[PDB]
Amino acid sequence: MHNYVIIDAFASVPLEGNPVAVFFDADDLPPAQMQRIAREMNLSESTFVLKPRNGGDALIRIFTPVNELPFAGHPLLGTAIALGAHTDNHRLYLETQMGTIAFELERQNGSVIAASMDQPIPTWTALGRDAELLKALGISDSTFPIEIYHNGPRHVFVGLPSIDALSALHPDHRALSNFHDMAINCFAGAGRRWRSRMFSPAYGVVEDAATGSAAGPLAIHLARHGQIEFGQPVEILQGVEIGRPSLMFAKAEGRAEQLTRVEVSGNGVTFGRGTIVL
Amino acid sequence: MHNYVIIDAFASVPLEGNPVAVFFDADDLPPAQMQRIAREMNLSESTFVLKPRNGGDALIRIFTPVNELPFAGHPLLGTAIALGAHTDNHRLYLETQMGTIAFELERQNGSVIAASMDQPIPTWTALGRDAELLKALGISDSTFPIEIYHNGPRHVFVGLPSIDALSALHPDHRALSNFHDMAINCFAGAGRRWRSRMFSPAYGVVEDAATGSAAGPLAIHLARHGQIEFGQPVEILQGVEIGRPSLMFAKAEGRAEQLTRVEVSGNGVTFGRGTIVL
């Protein structure tokens, strides 16, 4: 009854990046059933491709094993790459709970290998729990201001003075569980090239492979704090320490006070394909 | 490159019971790759069907997303039901790290709908942390002695005076995380019919749908404590509260001091089928 594909998002090699299951022709599935299927698959998200209701190409609903999400970066990227297999269009308009997200698809010989999305514009403020967070992470201080960004999920950024220092982190995950409804993103790098690790008890992941919705906020954080310019693309490599390398590209256009576009792009690859019995 | 099926073990209806992914013809996969695939699928277990090395029908390796397991009940039951689709034999001998487990397959029109296994004979002793465990569970006392059983995994049993009391449990999962390398199985019932809930921070599950390896130990616990006889089959219904009903049948033959057979059986159903790219 339903076809699905498993896409590793932010990777070009299977078993790298972050998997999402994408279910096609889902209009006959009530959302209670979509939630049960997402629970059954147990991937960080499963998405469901529905007929559009506002002039887009398709309406996408995104579910973790436990709840529906209004926005998620890696699941949406994977969905666009999956759906790109059944269309010839250059651009793909995906309706979500939060509006229609424009995707540019990149192909080779009819195969979609990558896509770029324009993300919701985040907001941000100081976290204001620095000593607590630093203690939990096991370090004394951040490099750049510890700020928390909101674009659906919330992501806090803590900067490390080198990639080695980033890899040496061994956080107190019990201590981190006191930070509700957010993910902790630790980063290090220079110039165009940055490394990240994400930890989130609130979002049910000890350490995440590819935090798509943190990539845009990171490019903003770096530009605001003078490490790159607004409009300069950055490469963010995540998940190396846990053996799930994920490459996210991001760019924040405009200025802090008036952001014009937050672009995030990356590769996607098919890990598997199947059908389910309902 | 590899075919797989998703079997809901201890269920006859898709989305009930406990899913396992079973990968066929896995001899060309090194165990490091099997572990990576199990991580990718993220189901409580994935299993891999290999050529036998000691006169069995097949050698099965069982992986959680994080490690290999020497024995697991629901994954093995699901594997036997999956593999039963590619043989006509009445009995199926599955080699595992811990020896060859004999499965009787039950068919209708060539479809395997159920199977029975003879489990490893458990051992047991008092847990000796009663007040700590009871506090964590949020109740004052158990009905029957709080004993911990070992058959690979470890399972502790805490008895409740009614099914309603079992459903009313709201455990302190942080407090439960102090119980390492075990699962906490709470039960209630009468006669042939029992209800269970399982919680296990050590094994990475907040509440489990079908704890196959606890079913045999529960039948022993009940017979030792005079609620059923040795040799009497019990029906154990798990996972009702979390909307994943799982029906496990168990029987412990012999006597406490000399157990002859610990039989656990149940239904299995295919939820999905697919192929992966490596």
Swiss-Prot record, chains A, B:
Pfam families: PhzC-PhzF. Pathway: Antibiotic biosynthesis; phenazine biosynthesis. Belongs to the PhzF family. One of its GO terms (biological process) is phenazine biosynthetic process. Homodimer. One of its GO terms (molecular function) is trans-2,3-dihydro-3-hydroxy-anthranilate isomerase activity. The keyword Isomerase applies. It catalyses: (5S,6S)-6-amino-5-hydroxycyclohexa-1,3-diene-1-carboxyate = (1R,6S)-6-amino-5-oxocyclohex-2-ene-1-carboxylate. Keywords: Antibiotic biosynthesis, Isomerase, Virulence. The active site is at E45. It comes from the Bacteria. One of its GO terms (cellular component) is cytoplasm. Its EC number is 5.3.3.17. This is Trans-2,3-dihydro-3-hydroxyanthranilate isomerase. The lineage of its organism: Bacteria, Pseudomonadati, Pseudomonadota, Gammaproteobacteria, Pseudomonadales. Gene3D superfamilies: Diaminopimelate Epimerase, Chain A, domain 1. Isomerase that catalyzes the condensation of two molecules of trans-2,3-dihydro-3-hydroxyanthranilic acid (DHHA) into the phenazine ring system. The final product is not yet known.
